[PDB]
């Protein structure tokens, strides 16, 4: 409720009024503190969602994402104070302002009790991210990338606006509790299909599925490190949160309309993971991997099965934390080599021994190696999908097969092998980079002991 | 022009619009329109450049034609009803006649062709007056006679307003032409809801007004009329270009910025009126405004365009303008969404 | 207060203060022609405000202390450097001329601002209407590229069109060999190496273009070296005109009020100088421009608006 | 030379100035303090006690209360001999099914 929101926004004057060089310090102090307070929120009751007021409420689904976002907030600050050190104090303060303002909107969105209130900051998250991608992005095509990311979601979000207000004028309030209790069987009238399409495509765009996913490679690659993680570790999950809330009034229309999306998703993951197998850009390879994992969630949510929902949240947290780590991996070696081509810097393990270990366990987590939460998420979805239909295991398992190859492909190409001779600027890895890496991987294994925390409301 | 003469000319222009909004007699409504026209031309001619003369001539021809056309709408309504009172009129042809007559003053349909060109010819301050104050009077009549309007006739005007107004904006360099095209696009948004509920036509009016000042007298502050000229302003005063970009997205309608409040409310009303296809197209065409909106933001502050060594002088000196009401204009035009339920005050 | 519209409404006119001693007399001539010397007696013998020749740091002189700021922070060009390699690849020659044109353009406004607010005439060296003669000469030997010319007069017509031409201009006629004698005595090693062509090229651009073209909007009287040192004779001549030609002797307080509006706005006077046409000599990239501007901002006094810099000692900021 | 610009600055090595550099910023003393902040309020405060907080969180989802109701329910159920758990949930006797 307010015990997390006000400290977040009150953090904004602190960065603006802090000393010239303490901005990274003081922001990092309390960003970690906010996560601690958010961690207290993670407690959930039996079946009734933890309700605070008309304006804010939390359930077993919002809380794991809430603690994930607040936990993330220190990490961008940790990962960004290397390419922004040679910048004027105002721009650094302006940069820090963007993240915490962004992080404020995520907290508001997940805790929102009204779909329209959910909707308002559902779009508001883009304004800081667009600034981050364009202004502080370090490339040329970031301009086109920002346009692609902005227009794609808007093209899907605006039909949702017309859809949501239609529910308001037809079924009164759109409060999540009232909409869930007063759910009615959606008819199969040819208008209801377009009712269904509008209520779904908005989350589809910012949950990249095959076809509607071309903004992700350009956004992820071109954005700076902090922009890449936030857009890949929490932002893609905004679509995921939207469905679990919004398919309450889309049944039994979801039973029949799911086929075109299911077919695009299940086939898409095989295609997208195949792209990973032959990617030239390390960041792009990680970006396309996010498409495959998210496409797996698409099948999970659209099936509408208790097991599918539980694995959906499990993969939701796991993929975000893992993708954030991998983007840190790609970021950590990038400025050393000042390029994104994978084969440019080979044999990094011989020069940097610990980064080999960090990149190793990053690969295993992305591998869905048991008992990492990624495996729990993927394995749960397999059983739910298999009960839905027996054939899907052929598609389902083949993704795990392809996922093994490309995940290790970056490991062998970069970490192992002969070091490239000409490069001589690779310095011993800064303890900040090492600490940031453990900041990511360690809570993942810590979560292995308590999957029930991130299973979701269906648990 | 003598400042006292300039003050009087503006004084009548606002009174003419004031006269329109306070007249219960159709003849007086015309009086306010014409004497507003009578004093609008010299303001456009203040700079006195051949472009301004072309701009003023184009503006007078279209506005004089609309006003003369407006008479038969009054005269025909007189003829069939003998009522000078400004209420629901009693003739479809008279209703149809004035709808084009008032539309040409606003410039939504192909009638809009004068709107961009006149703004280009004349100075920034004159364009600010034309695009903000000179839109209250024609809108005021439509608000009063909204109950008599043919829904099909006016909605078609609104669609082509935002369609062409949004569409031509992609191909504009001179910032004045972008503003006029954006103004045409915003013109349709309010007029689309006008037959349904006039309250948020007014709500769209004040909000769209607030940006248009915030845009223009920021541009006046920048003293720039070309995208390249605006681009150089990052070197002199990067802060202005920062506030430039905030309003640019607010004018686009991205939440939680202020400019989202009109569009959101407009969509809600027609959805109540069962019209759900109509809002969807306008929302889809709203991104068209956002594109060239984003292009200026890319050129202004988000990127950093090259500058000229002669810019070094501008660092040494300072601005002499007092930019009145500027500090509250942007703030009221960027973050007022939480105070949305205040729209009932307009009712 | 200033000439703001309230002042004009309440009664502040311009024709009241100006009198017979209100002219924009310019002392002009060849390189090292003693025009700066000749400007002084005209100033002292007429009670008439003097303006020294606008250099690279003239704009620096107007602002702040007036101490010449760093060339990197103000000018990106050195006249002595231009002497060493006039056709240098960095574009020092055109950067020098374009900056020089801006400084004298600012000087022209400062002259008009003082005259229009005091009624006292102004004498200045090498008015902006004669600045082109160097660029034409600098274009003769290819010291600048062809693309510099159209940029220069593009700034000219977008700026110098509004600024009306002076009352009477005086010219110090000096033959090329005479300059080729003087610059030896000056001794500064950078001013030994001007080619006779450059002294020639400024000379004919004067005779065939400068004096005759603008002779029809103000009287032109030539003086040679012997006539130059005769301060008593020349000053008598300047008093012996009725100033027929020129746009000065027909306007009323309306134009003067409008003129003082533009001139007082020190941003507006040269707003068009930073013209967005891009050429290698004058265009500076974003990284260099951003670093220099940050270097300019961190300087004292310039961090905030004038009267708002606590570092220099602007007390009561919380009240101002 | 296209534009008057600056060459691409060389990436400074934080180590060559101070070999004990921690990669957090340039100034040493705050760098050492940045170490203390990130590890303390990171690993120590958040990770350790936060893990104990979530590990020792009170009954979540009523996982054990549901159990405690189960055995008392089942022990009652087979004590009488009636079926262990009814196939029907909302007692049909009070249901007023149409026709």
């Amino acid at each position: 409720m307010l015990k997390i929101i006000i400290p977040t926004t009150m953090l904004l004057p602190m960065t603006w009024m802090s000393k010239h060089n303490m901005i990274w310090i003081n922001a990092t102090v309390h960003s970690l503190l906010i996560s601690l307070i958010s961690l207290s929120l993670l407690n959930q009751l039996g079946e009734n969602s933890l309700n605070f007021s008309l304006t804010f409420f939390s359930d077993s689904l919002s809380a794991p994402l809430l603690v994930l976002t607040t936990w993330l907030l220190p990490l961008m600050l940790m990962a960004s104070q290397s390419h922004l050190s040679k910048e004027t104090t105002t721009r650094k303060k302006l940069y820090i302002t963007m993240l915490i303002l962004l992080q404020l909107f995520l907290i508001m969105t997940f805790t929102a009790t009204e779909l329209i209130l959910f909707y308002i900051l559902f779009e508001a998250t883009l304004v800081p991210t667009l600034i981050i991608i364009t202004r502080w992005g370090n490339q040329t095509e970031r301009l086109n990338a920002g346009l692609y990311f902005l227009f794609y979601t808007l093209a899907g979000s605006l039909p949702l606006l017309v859809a949501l207000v239609y529910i308001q004028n037809t079924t009164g309030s759109l409060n999540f509790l009232i909409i869930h209790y007063w759910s009615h069987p959606l008819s199969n009238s040819w208008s209801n299909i377009f009712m269904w399409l509008a209520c779904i495509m908005a989350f589809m765009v910012k949950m990249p599925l095959y076809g509607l996913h071309l903004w992700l490679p350009k956004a992820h690659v071109e954005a700076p490190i902090a922009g890449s993680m936030v857009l890949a570790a929490v932002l893609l999950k905004l679509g995921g949160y939207g469905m679990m809330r919004i398919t309450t009034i889309l049944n039994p229309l979801t039973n029949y309309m799911a086929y075109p999306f299911l077919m695009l998703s299940m086939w898409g993951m095989i295609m997208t993971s195949s792209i990973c197998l032959r990617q030239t850009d390390l960041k792009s390879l990680i970006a396309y991997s996010s498409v495959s994992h998210m496409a797996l969630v698409i099948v999970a949510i659209m099936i509408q099965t208790p097991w599918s929902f539980m694995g959906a949240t499990a993969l939701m947290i796991a993929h975000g934390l893992t993708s954030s780590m991998l983007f840190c991996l790609a970021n950590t070696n990038y400025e050393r080599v000042h390029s994104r081509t994978m084969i440019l810097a080979r044999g990094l393990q011989t020069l940097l021994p610990l980064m080999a270990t960090w990149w190793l366990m990053a690969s295993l987590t992305n591998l869905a190696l048991p008992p990492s939460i990624n495996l729990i998420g993927e394995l749960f979805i397999i059983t739910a999908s298999f009960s839905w239909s027996n054939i899907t295991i052929i598609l389902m398992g083949m993704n795990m097969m392809i996922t093994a190859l490309y995940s290790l492909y970056m490991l062998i190409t970069t970490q192992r092998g002969k070091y490239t001779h000409h490069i001589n600027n690779i310095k011993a890895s800064f303890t900040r980079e090492n600490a940031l890496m453990a900041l990511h991987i360690l809570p993942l294994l810590l979560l292995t002991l308590n999957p029930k925390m991130i299973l979701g409301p269906l648990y | 022009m003598n400042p006292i003469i300039y003050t009087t000319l503006i004084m009548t222009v606002m009174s003419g619009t004031m006269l329109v909004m306070i007249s219960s007699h159709w003849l007086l409504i015309w009086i306010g329109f014409e004497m507003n026209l009578l004093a609008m031309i010299p303001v456009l001619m203040k700079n006195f450049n051949p472009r301004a003369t072309e701009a003023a001539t184009k503006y007078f021809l279209t506005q004089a034609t609309a006003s003369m056309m407006l008479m038969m709408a009054i005269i025909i309504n007189l003829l069939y009803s003998g009522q000078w009172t400004i209420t629901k009129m009693f003739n479809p042809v008279a209703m149809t006649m004035m709808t084009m007559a008032l539309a040409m003053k606003l410039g939504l349909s192909p009638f809009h062709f004068w709107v961009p060109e006149v703004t280009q010819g004349i100075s920034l301050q004159a364009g600010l007056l034309l695009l903000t104050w000179q839109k209250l009077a024609p809108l005021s009549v439509l608000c009063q006679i909204s109950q008599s309007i043919n829904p099909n006739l006016m909605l078609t005007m609104a669609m082509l307003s935002i369609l062409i107004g949004g569409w031509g904006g992609l191909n504009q360099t001179q910032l004045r032409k972008i503003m006029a095209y954006s103004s045409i696009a915003h013109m349709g948004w309010m007029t689309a809801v006008l037959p349904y509920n006039t309250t948020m036509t007014i709500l769209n009016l004040l909000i769209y007004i607030t940006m248009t000042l915030a845009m223009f007298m920021l541009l006046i502050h920048s003293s720039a009329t070309t995208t390249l000229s605006l681009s150089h302003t990052w070197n002199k005063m990067p802060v202005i270009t920062s506030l430039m970009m905030v309003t640019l997205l607010s004018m686009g309608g991205l939440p939680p910025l202020s400019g989202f409040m009109p569009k959101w409310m407009i969509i809600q009303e027609m959805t109540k009126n069962e019209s759900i296809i109509m809002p969807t197209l306008m929302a889809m065409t709203a991104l068209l405004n956002l594109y060239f909106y984003m292009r200026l933001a890319y050129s202004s502050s988000l990127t950093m365009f090259p500058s000229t060594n002669n810019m070094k002088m501008k660092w040494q000196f300072e601005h002499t303008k007092q930019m009145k009401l500027l500090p509250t204009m942007i703030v009221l035009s960027t973050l007022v969404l939480p105070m949305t339920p205040a729209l009932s005050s307009l009712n | 207060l200033q000439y703001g519209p309230l002042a004009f409404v309440l009664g502040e006119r311009t024709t009241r203060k100006l009198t017979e001693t209100s002219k924009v007399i310019t002392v002009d001539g060849n390189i090292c022609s003693g025009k700066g010397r000749l400007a002084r007696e005209i100033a002292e013998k007429l009670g008439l405000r003097h303006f020294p020749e606008a250099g690279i740091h003239y704009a620096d002189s107007t602002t702040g202390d007036g101490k010449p700021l760093d060339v990197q922070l103000s000018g990106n060009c050195s006249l002595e450097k231009f002497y060493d390699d006039p056709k240098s690849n960095d574009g020092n020659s055109y950067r020098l001329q374009s900056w020089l044109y801006a400084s004298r353009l600012l000087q022209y406004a400062d002259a008009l601002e003082h005259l229009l607010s005091t009624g006292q005439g102004v004498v200045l060296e090498r008015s902006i209407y004669s600045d082109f003669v160097f660029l034409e000469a600098m274009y003769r030997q290819g010291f600048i590229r062809k693309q510099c010319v159209e940029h220069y007069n593009e700034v000219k017509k977008v700026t110098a069109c509004e600024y009306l031409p002076p009352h009477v201009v005086v010219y110090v006629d000096v033959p090329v060999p005479e300059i080729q004698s003087r610059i030896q005595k000056k001794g500064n090693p950078h001013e030994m190496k001007i080619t006779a062509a450059y002294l020639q090229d400024i000379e004919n651009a004067y005779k065939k273009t400068f004096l005759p073209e603008m002779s029809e909007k103000c009287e032109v009287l030539q003086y040679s070296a012997r006539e130059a040192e005769d301060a008593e004779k020349v000053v008598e001549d300047i008093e012996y005109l009725k100033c027929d030609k020129g746009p000065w002797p027909d306007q009323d307080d309306r134009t003067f009020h409008r003129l003082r509006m533009l001139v007082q706005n020190k941003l507006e006077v040269l707003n068009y100088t930073t013209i967005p046409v891009y050429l290698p000599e004058i265009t500076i990239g974003a990284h260099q421009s951003d670093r220099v501007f940050q270097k300019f901002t961190e300087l004292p006094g310039r961090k905030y608006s004038p009267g708002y810099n606590e570092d220099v000692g602007d007390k009561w900021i919380w009240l101002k | 030379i296209r534009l008057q610009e600056d060459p691409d600055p060389e990436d400074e090595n934080l180590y060559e100035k101070n070999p004990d550099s921690h990669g957090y910023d340039k100034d040493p003393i705050v760098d050492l303090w940045n170490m203390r902040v990130v590890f303390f309020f990171g690993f120590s405060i958040v990770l350790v006690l936060g893990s104990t907080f979530v590990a020792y969180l009170p009954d979540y989802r009523m996982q054990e209360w549901a159990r405690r109701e189960a055995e008392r329910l089942v022990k009652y159920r087979e004590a009488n001999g009636l079926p262990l758990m009814e196939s029907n949930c909302f007692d049909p006797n009070k249901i007023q099914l149409p026709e």
Binding site: - | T173, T227, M304, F305, P306 | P276, Y278, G285, A286 | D8
Partner: peptide
């Protein structure tokens, strides 16, 4: 350093129209 626009990008947005043609060429 991060990429910044140059005369190529500037002239892209400079001219009569960013989307020119034969008709707008003159």
């Amino acid at each position: 350093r991060q990429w910044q626009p140059d005369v190529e990008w500037a002239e892209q947005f400079g001219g009569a129209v960013m989307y020119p043609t034969k008709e707008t060429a003159h």
